[model samples]
Target: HMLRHSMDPPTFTFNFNNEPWVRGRHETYLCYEVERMHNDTWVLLNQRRGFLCNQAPHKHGFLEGRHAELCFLDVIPFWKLDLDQDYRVTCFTSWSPCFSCAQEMAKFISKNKHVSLCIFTARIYDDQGRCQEGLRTLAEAGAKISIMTYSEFKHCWDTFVDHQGCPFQPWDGLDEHSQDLSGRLRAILQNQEN
Candidate 1:
């Protein structure tokens, strides 16, 4: 005879889990949280998500997942959002922004002085010379770059996710690695200025 132990089934949430892009191993999901200042408090204005994709023909129905930055660019205009007032935009992405996207973001921030951007990622994309340089450019333009720390990760889990009663579980060394990444980012920005 055999005995069976019952267990609960796994739960899921509506959070951006990077499933679509991870399956093909060809894209990264970029998620952004836009906030505006109102009466000395920050209010959540919008949340957006997009994935990286090749410039396939629009006629072939490939327009939906074009580089994440392009998606934000398209929607910002419709929202009628301006950086003239205090605004902060946070991006949580599977991979860091590409060089081209970084350049475009720098331009946007430069034009809108009251706007600030913070990008949090699990890893940088293809650690190469150009990618590092692009990140430096963004730092010089006043964007804060960081890897997701435990608190930041927990914050995202709480604010942007529906865990369905499952508690947030952090991987080993998550906090330490995040601290190291934060130090590296600070160095990068400091070096850029000097």
Candidate 2:
């Protein structure tokens, strides 16, 4: 039998502001930040940004911002820290992981049983069937997925972001979009069961 311990849930957040959209560029900018729980507080571990390379649009553009998911994948091995010991791993990004990244994340979690991942994104990128399947795979792999809410945005701004005196502003129709994404995710997962 597993022993039960009474403890407060860990807090998680991502602080850095990413350059998601570039001028005259049609590629998506992907970024991620990692945090670990220490002494009942969340501490920043690592942050990185990457762009979609090998894809069109960026073929003739800048090469520096390619393979954002690979950027995160490469850093995982360097942590070398105990992830199951009260670690609340959180990732924040402009868009949710693509099908390939989702598969990668699922594999990582399956291999690292101690690690728990919670992904917060402004929107879900369901460009093709792969995105939906990827998200479902992530759920099957025991990953928690959420759409960023107003309160979560405020928390990130207050705790992690250096807004340079800029107050956290709630975007218009944010609630609607969040709800819509949640519904879509639920539908996708439900469909997988059929």
Candidate 3:
């Protein structure tokens, strides 16, 4: 019920670019999984994240943006009957959620108390002041929003891309890009009243 074709290396890297970002690429790619808490080995436990609740009967996909997260949300109706359980939907998105989508997502979390949402975005989309406001609401609604860094990129490379067994190549400004965005987002999360 959605557009999903696994990513090749360059297309995945280009969108997840950090500081000194690349330009004119506007599609948002979202990769996600429904994780059952304490059910599997995490990349982050050894390094930094989620890879699927195990290869045993789980749901996951790579999606192109159309308010990408919302598209992912639509699929949950088919996910285990949207049942009550300790399930976390962890998502990695190319662009952070825009304002309206953020608000909608926050509302969803409020309504679905059994599921937890953790989001790691490649870019903040803070070009609009409204986007930051959206993230703020999402955070308030208990969505764990973060800007993706090196480990997450590599995780996506290995888990979502059909990389043909190639190792992930780190670009020049990965750390700086991630940290700057993380810092800016941190500021927004801290001062919502202003």
Candidate 4:
């Protein structure tokens, strides 16, 4: 039998003050998906990079149970645009939430009652590309919601960017485009649920 739990949600914001956008140089705001491979493995993929696994799904650590659904919140930031320098900032910001993590969250929600789901925002684009709003709408419909501030995201990006060029670590993972697609899907889901 599934139990029901009440969900208390938090307020999340995404600020992009650090991630400058350039017209021709860096226009697109990219999102990637982080998936699990083994018991605690996580990999992030973009179109060009491919699959690269580094830590366990819950390695960076995640809130347990209903809180797991809020994994999107940890997605902070992985890239930045330096309009002045005409360069794009790359960073590694997340690991992954294990399949067990997912199952555990599902079971908890089922056991608990009316636990609100929160879809964390990947980016906050303008009205023309207002995907974040859509995600909010979906969350409004049913899921609980919050957003990550752009500054927080930039912090994550900076951390990873500094260490990305380190020696290749095997059993680590590949860099693929899968993560980007997952981010898009997350956007769509947020749009629908909101």
Candidate 5:
């Protein structure tokens, strides 16, 4: 007799037991997580927007109280913000199905919490060689500088001669990448203002 399994409804959590759909979601989540490492404090950003899976309603549903913050760079088409660049960090850790996994989750949460704080505390530098004095002072205080810059502010312009193909553009769109960048922008703005 063939094994019978329900494919829909009563959705399984992040721990999918080889179910094709759940498996796909898990993989997608992993990839999404990896890509979020490139920008500002994603956790804080996710906190700002409220962490709810942006995937299709049927494709997934997030567990309650899962927080995420993501950062991504805007995609440029001939040096313009591609409004479709929707990217953001998402924070959602799976609940433990067993004591072992539960303990593991606790450790993971502990480590990730630090990561979140690190991201929030990190400095983001602006392009155009115009540095923030506060950030400079912080840098003097032993904090490292994380540069964020682009070429010209308009279309089809060359970026810093050293870093080619860096186009400056606004943050917009609903795609995962764009969402992430918007989050970074939020962090940078907040830090600069303070």
Candidate 6:
């Protein structure tokens, strides 16, 4: 579904069926867990998933589908509740944001200073130089972006995906790949801040 309202609700999930977690990929899926600062503590707000999709031509279509990150913007506006305080948005994306999504997200965070974002991505977007610059831009704008670790994988599996009570399992190369991806991202960002 293009919007989260059409999709099933999230079950504090990260994303295992994600980038460390993909099956016949095409679209980006964002599994998110949200929290807000309440009396000096961060408490649960909501958690859900949304797909990246292009709107139909007659319905305000763009040249490209809104990336899962951008599509997520619909959620905040949809919320009838107001955010007079701080909100923390944490998500596990199957793919790290693309060039434009990063730019847009940076803009969103810069303007909505009451919100902070931490993206634990399943994988980096398969890319050229532009994607790296985009990541840097997002970071400089105050987003914390990182590749998911094994611990995170287990956590996501248990909390987010429909595991049906079975113990979390690890696929081959999960750790190696996460490490490789993390190192590559760090190199791109010059091992910078969270």
What Cα-based lDDT does every candidate model obtain? 0.57, 0.56, 0.58, 0.33, 0.27, 0.61
Q: Candidate 3's residue-wise lDDT over 1-194, tens digit each?
A: 64455433456667754433222364233456554444333222121222221123235754333364464465455544424334566676655666677777777776665556777677553466645676777767767777777777776566545553447776888777777667767867776455
Model 3: lDDT equals 0.58
Residue-level lDDT of model 4, residues 1-194, one tens digit each, is 54332111211124423444312254323233333222233233443222232224666775443222333223322233122222111222232222343334334334542333433333322333343443333333444333333433443433333343333222211122333434444554545343
Which candidate order results from sorting by TM-score in descending order? 6, 1, 3, 2, 4, 5
Error of 4 at 188 (Å): 16
Off by over 4 Å in 6: 1-28, 36-63, 162-166, 191-194
Better of 4 and 6 by lDDT: 6
Candidate 5's TM-score: 0.18
Which candidate comes out best when scored by lDDT? 6
lDDT of 6 by residue, 25-130 (tens): 5643456665656645666755543243335575665445566555545555555455554566776664667667777877887776555777777665364764
**Per-residue error at 110 for model 4, in Å?**
15
State the lDDT of candidate 2 residue by residue for 1-194, as single tens digits. 54332111221124244344322165545445655555545666454322343444546664343334434454556565554434555566635555666777667766664456767666554456545776677666766777777776665444345443336678787778777666667767777443
Candidate 1 lDDT tens digits, 24-104: 576444566666665455776444333343455867565544344444444455556444445666666645555666667
Ranking of predictions according to lDDT: 6, 3, 1, 2, 4, 5
Question: For model 6, which pairs clash?
Answer: 18-21
lDDT of 1 at 71: 44
Return the top candidate by TM-score: 6
Weakest 10 consecutive residues, lDDT, candidate 1?
Answer: 2-11
Q: lDDT tens digits, residues 9-63, model 5?
A: 2344545344342114443221112123323332112222122234333346543
